[PDB]
Design an enzyme around this catalytic site. Structure first.
Site, PDB file in Angstrom:
ATOM      1  CE1 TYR A 127      42.206  25.405  61.765  1.00  0.00           C
ATOM      2  CE2 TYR A 127      40.785  27.258  61.829  1.00  0.00           C
ATOM      3  CZ  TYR A 127      41.954  26.586  61.477  1.00  0.00           C
ATOM      4  OH  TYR A 127      42.869  27.365  60.885  1.00  0.00           O
TER       5      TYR A 127
ATOM      6  CE1 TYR B 116      51.499  31.935  64.325  1.00  0.00           C
ATOM      7  CE2 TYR B 116      50.963  33.941  65.868  1.00  0.00           C
ATOM      8  CZ  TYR B 116      51.635  33.052  65.336  1.00  0.00           C
ATOM      9  OH  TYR B 116      53.093  33.342  65.060  1.00  0.00           O
ATOM     10  CG  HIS B 117      43.692  30.470  62.423  1.00  0.00           C
ATOM     11  ND1 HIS B 117      43.997  30.068  60.985  1.00  0.00           N
ATOM     12  CD2 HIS B 117      44.473  31.782  62.407  1.00  0.00           C
ATOM     13  CE1 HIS B 117      44.467  31.031  60.378  1.00  0.00           C
ATOM     14  NE2 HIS B 117      44.577  32.001  61.221  1.00  0.00           N
TER      15      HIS B 117
ATOM     16  NE  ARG C 111      48.190  35.612  61.786  1.00  0.00           N
ATOM     17  CZ  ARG C 111      49.220  35.276  61.276  1.00  0.00           C
ATOM     18  NH1 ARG C 111      49.445  34.852  60.070  1.00  0.00           N
ATOM     19  NH2 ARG C 111      50.201  35.280  61.964  1.00  0.00           N
TER      20      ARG C 111
END
Lengths: 223, 223, 223, 223
Positions: B156, B159-160, B129
């Protein structure tokens, strides 16, 4: 256009006489068309048909095939009758997940009223159904094509039988005034349709010859 | 218009070089944008994005913020993909309660067919995602903007990931012919996008720095 | 038109000064309007309002009243907010049974966006609701009327209160530029709205003064 | 057109005076119209009516009758009121299976507002219903016909009664300005409608005189 070739997965697909083919034409394929050991009809496909019974394992395989540059598919059509007793809810479930999938009944098969009524009555009161080959011919008729060349249809060499497939083809011949031709002289289909009036398939290597399976977690999220 | 600045909640939001900003532009914010200790990008916001996971606690806080004259928001956009396996029913539940909330997928994200198909396939078959920053960029592309200045996106700093966020940005660059710029020289994002060619943020006092919670009886009527 | 008189069931309905009434006007009634001992406002009614809480016992009584030639009603309007937490499903159930009932929210109340958002927020996050008198005024504003004469509204002589009814009326005054007048000098409402600048009600005999109840089998088929 | 003959299944169908028939006309039949021992009104039928209570056993029988070349039917109309308490869901179930069936209420019966409101009130609050003969007359009125010749309606020689059938016919006479005629002098119906101002039926042999039943597996798939 005018001419279109519809092909099945029968054993007569390898016995095509290439002298009878027209100049310009389109090719229709269905189901496990990627099991060929040779490129009988090239790598250009106008449309492909997938049954609602197995669709998740087919879209993934088609995506992998198109990523590796093995076939050039233009459209994907779902072979659904939208009948409440077979695949009404499954078609909606499939369409809620994908946006590039074309529903066959809503777009092409609903424009033939007499054929639709005939099929619905036979499905409801007699438990009889047609195969994918007749579905492709009906869609080709409904899309404006006039010349339809049949191949790979060996007539099953319990819903499906040979008294509904032949009766449906004669129904479309009488009601919509289209021409059917057979390009496999040794096929039993040539006994019912005339042979038209008067190229080695390249071999495939390191190709995919089995249906791919999605990972385990795919089924968990759908259940 | 032509230019738009999209900002995240990363630690590089305070390290913006104000010499690279254009003349006329719009600002996009998302999630907990009201935790700023300074007015980095002013108090005028073109649109705001709230995820369906937490929306009741966000609309109430936004109403309280707008009542006290702290920000001037124009639109509220729900960041929903309308996919049956994540937030299809919750989006309908949210839209049944409010009338001034704009659904992102139906209005802007459905007009990018290739990107939509790519995202749906990756969501269904790979469990991957995108974040809100890519969602805002896609919406800005779909709303006619051509120059997009990214900030506050530190990549970050399950999901990601960083192999889908970078791949999605390159997908939009190749397919829709838009320009991406980075206005934070020290951010790692500048290593992938060019710095454009060649103001103290006022302090905030007695501001709201926490997400407000609705009373207890609000949850009872919804359950 | 231009002028409309909205009346409630308060104790000040019998203390109307008939010198302040305009020439041409329409009358709005609601709920148990047939309990009058005198014809205060005649027997011609432009529209009537029935709450979804009790509707089957009201339609039957209205049919019986109209059959006996006691009132001449033109329209029947359902006072529904179409909010999921109060009367969303009951409104659909009522509309599935009758075809001559007009839904208030869909037709008139949805065209006031700011007022609708205000009401929805107050209903969802504060447990506050407006009475039928404010609903009739909002519908009259949304139907093009400009002069609204209030009567029979004594301001309750736990959702309903006097801090929402007065705040909603001021909201409509500020946002839509309409004129409110009071025709009962002794009513407390006159302290907030100006008295306009400068007829015995006939008695009713053998009239219906109680709400009629449907037979027992009516409830069985609905359950 | 202008003239139409509506016929029931009463005992006066065999006592028709053929000197009173007009020149050009259409015939309406309903329910078990194929039990005739003689061709009283020929073999040409403009429309047929089947109740939702028994429809699967009627469509099959009609298909078999039309296959054997016994009648020439043009339309098939479902006699549904679309009321939630009688046949709302069954009508949807029937329409989901067939595509050549016309729903009576949506197409013809919804264009008579006063009659529809009258019928709905009487159904909801009094448990009274009309027969198929009045339904056919209402549909004929709603389709533009002006002269309606009634036959085979003997007025039942617990919902159905003689105080609703006669009251409904007078309602249509007063509100829509149509002419009703009776072509059976000895029928009790002639006492209410005027006789118009001034041919042996062929016998039927080896005909179907019973309602056919579908095979057992048909019910299994529907349950």
């Amino acid at each position: 256009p005018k001419a279109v070739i519809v092909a099945g997965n029968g054993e007569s697909l390898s016995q095509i006489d290439y002298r009878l083919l027209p100049k310009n034409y389109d090719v229709f394929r269905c189901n496990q068309f990627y099991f060929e050991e040779r490129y009988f009809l090239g790598n250009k496909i106008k449309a492909v048909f997938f049954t609602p019974g197995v669709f998740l394992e087919q879209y993934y395989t088609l995506y992998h095939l198109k990523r590796n540059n093995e076939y050039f598919v233009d459209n994907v059509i779902l072979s659904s009758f939208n009948h409440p007793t077979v695949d009404l809810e499954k078609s909606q479930k499939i369409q809620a997940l994908f946006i590039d999938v074309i529903n066959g009944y809503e777009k092409h098969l609903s424009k033939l009223t007499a054929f639709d009524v005939y099929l619905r009555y036979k499905e409801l009161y007699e438990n009889q159904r047609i195969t994918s080959g007749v579905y492709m011919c009906a869609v080709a008729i409904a899309m404006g094509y006039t010349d339809i060349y049949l191949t790979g249809i060996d007539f099953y060499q319990s819903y499906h039988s040979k008294d509904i497939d032949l009766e449906a083809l004669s129904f479309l011949q009488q009601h919509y005034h289209v021409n059917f031709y057979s390009i496999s002289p040794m096929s039993p289909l040539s006994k019912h349709f005339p042979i038209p009036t008067v190229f080695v398939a390249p071999l495939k290597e390191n190709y995919i010859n089995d249906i791919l399976l999605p990972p385990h977690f795919v089924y968990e999220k759908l259940g």
